[model samples]
Target: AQTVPYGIPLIKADKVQAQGFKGANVKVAVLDTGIQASHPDLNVVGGASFVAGEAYNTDGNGHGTHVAGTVAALDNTTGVLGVAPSVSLYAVKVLNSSGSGSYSGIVSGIEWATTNGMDVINMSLGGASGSTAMKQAVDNAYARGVVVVAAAGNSGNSGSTNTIGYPAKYDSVIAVGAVDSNSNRASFSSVGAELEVMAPGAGVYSTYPTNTYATLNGTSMASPHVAGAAALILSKHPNLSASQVRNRLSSTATYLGSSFYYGKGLINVEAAAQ
Candidate 1:
């Protein structure tokens, strides 16, 4: 009763699955609002809430749940499948119900993920500005062997400008941009030198709160696609360092267009897993 999302085959995650790589034993921390632990389609191993008065196990705004589902939704007859169906997911709630949180909260979430032995961290959030503390946190996580992936931001324009947001713009993280089923870059997906990859993001259907599903868009949805791919890669080559994992993804990516828009290109998880 399993169903495959269009992205799964577009990025060749389905092919990776055919090769028997399902991201088993890899830990992915979803650094977002949170995830719905009660969702039948997700397996949230553990989590922590950086947002005050909120629980990490429940997603109020539904953004975090959607992102988490993209990363590791269970392979079953109902709902949709994720890039890495068996990945262990952790909810690190840095954002609140309004889908907003301070940079300090995000930094704290990064630290928590690093300290807790997370193999990969998926940050589908970003800010217009950068912070010294946030950069340091991301650097530390990468140095600690955690593959960090983030949204490239949604402030895109035809004119050449660096719209890639902070944290994702940092050297240690993978900045993911949005692309549609046609492999065309989403108009709203930010473009810049920091953009490291592209993935299915527009009109992405995934798990939502209240035991439901939703179709959303943004670079937010794109980031977890790479994160889940990283989980699959790490699951197969458990000793690969964060940088090595990043290189595997980039090296195996399918060339699409300019580096400014597509970065390395669309991730080929099937090749990356090999």
Candidate 2:
């Protein structure tokens, strides 16, 4: 029995760490609302913001900080542990405090991540419409060998026939859905062809702003888990291409349902790192 944040064991992320892959030397960028740069448990190695008037990389909205925490909260004794705790984490703020941002902001974030050599980019956002600019940005990142991961959106079981949303719908990106602690697909997780994998999102616990912690829900929470896993995979097998990383994750998933609901399955970081 290993000691780790509760969610870490639930998703078997602890097992990945036990295998000696804690995403060391891998750079992961979170393009979200923002990250609380001063959070005690989370160390921001670098940052940039497309969000205006937001004090640089500081997370005024709690979403980005929570997302960043799951990806790499640090392996210290005093606070929650992340899936890939030792990875170099960057905050690329694309959304604002209201948790809203345009595709342009996201595209810019992707471009910046590509130019800066971020190995993995986590995007916990999506919209109903697709954009050529967004597609090109994702394609450009993939061509540069950056693993791009995004939330599949939260339109599930809401009476809407459409589920997965764009940026996630893009072929170059890996779209992640949500599953609960019991390994059940989350009721709110969207389903579509874009969904490549699932991760624990229900009642997810991670870092929050103001030097505190929080439990949140959404496919937004799920994306970072796979992002962290991608980092772990890169740490162990640094030679894999972006497509190869996606295949490593999807091919190794622990499937619990149809591909639409759970995708290939809940992301198995331990298995992928192997």
Candidate 3:
């Protein structure tokens, strides 16, 4: 049976879907481990691989697949619905099976997504340190009009700390943090001045490899929700510039708490769409 995950409604994507904004025609590049292209609930349109010896269409570590499912799993009758149910998903394999990737691979993936006409680029992976080349790549993609979204890193603690990572720390990217069902910030969700938004991440159930589903945690799960929201916004207003879309999301977000932790706030897709 088809089921709507709590995160979908938590961010008000269900209401946006009800308004006929299922992110149709918007291209979202999943820049991560990869995606299981054959998953029945996923609508993978195309992809490329930066990781050596890995196909862009197959996910071995299952991280990218889960992230992809959150962004655009098909609104079918079997598995589960994504935030933007019909967006075109492109698998850009930057990370290897161990969920590890070099900065060069990530930079290449960013370049590939930008040159390929992707509307949104979702980076659900990050590292502690920053790379100049990677930041330049992210900036280039943003200047080219791609809505870049990334995890805020899962290295936070109870006390406030600047745990954000790159390329999320870059000005060109929208850094996303994690919140649980009660709107409480996840203890592990990185917090910093760079965090741009929050989303459902704790116990997020999404599609996995082998046509199965699993619940996972991390700001990784949170970033895609915003990426899908970006798709929804772009679908309704295709002419809006990337910055404009970012503003719409931020301006319409439902404020939860401090700017440092929640950024503008939890994204409200329905509000942003309007």
Candidate 4:
């Protein structure tokens, strides 16, 4: 799985793609640090970003680009391929270069993604606590029926951490955890009962800034894997309820450990797609 691209196991990718969700024409929104619009892998549609009440969004840091790439980079012969080979990319810059943003900025991005009729939302960023404005925005998106997925966070495990990173903390959001190449626990992945499912995260290789590609590891990278997998599943059964789709993905997950090292378990796209 680690050697396989897109944070997916080779076995899993072939099975899921064969199940018919190349994510063609599906619109996916990335509401985090924005992405570089010109990257070959990511053909990002224009999006609005809120910065201190100003307009416009861009990938200040490479986090959004990486997450974006994992979800919908072009399915070219070269370079890493996104899980959704043919997804339409939409860019929304919320976080700054330091990879931090105000709760208001992120909420604005979420509202934009949902209102624009995005099918899937990939929020690979999170913070320690929640804000009222941001909380309302998340609930609003869910109420509108957008499939929202978010990172479970990278905060270490002392077992005292109840911190659900804002939007991800939202009940309706599909909270994702991480797994390793061998389908084992990753040292940095956050865990909890909210953990919906798992995907490869550590040493993840995907699109980056400056028209380059590199390996990164974080729940930030992991969340997109669940989303892309969900996109693939949705691609097959476009009419499935969001809750059903979520259940299918979770119930069919491949168990790695009894502990919360992984949520429902590691994502087995082939199984979920079928």
Per-model tally of clashing residue pairs:
1, 0, 0, 1
- Model 1, 1-274: lDDT tens digits are 5567788889998888777889999989999999999999988999999899998998889999999999898988988899999998899999999999998899999999999999999999989999999999999999999999999999987588889998899999999999999999999999998889899989898889988888998999999999999998888888888899899999999989999988999999988877
Q: How well is each residue in 206-233 modelled by candidate 3, as lDDT tens digits?
A: 9999999999999999999999999999
Clashing pairs in 2: none
Local error of candidate 4 at residue 131 (angstroms): 2.1
Q: Write the per-residue lDDT of candidate 4 for residues 81-183, one digit (tens) a residue.
A: 7888777778877877778887777887888898898888888888777788877877777777778889888874767555446567678898777666666
By TM-score, is 3 or 4 better?
3
Clashing pairs in 3: none
Candidate 2 per-residue lDDT over residues 205-234, each given as its tens digit: 888889888899999999998898899888
TM-score for candidate 2: 0.96
Candidate RMSDs in order? 0.9, 1.9, 0.9, 2.7
Superposed model 4: Cα runs more than 4 Å off: 1-6, 52-58, 160-163
Top lDDT: which candidate number? 3
TM-score of each: 0.98, 0.96, 0.98, 0.91
Worst 10 residues of 4 by lDDT: 1-10
lDDT score, candidate 3, position 242: 96
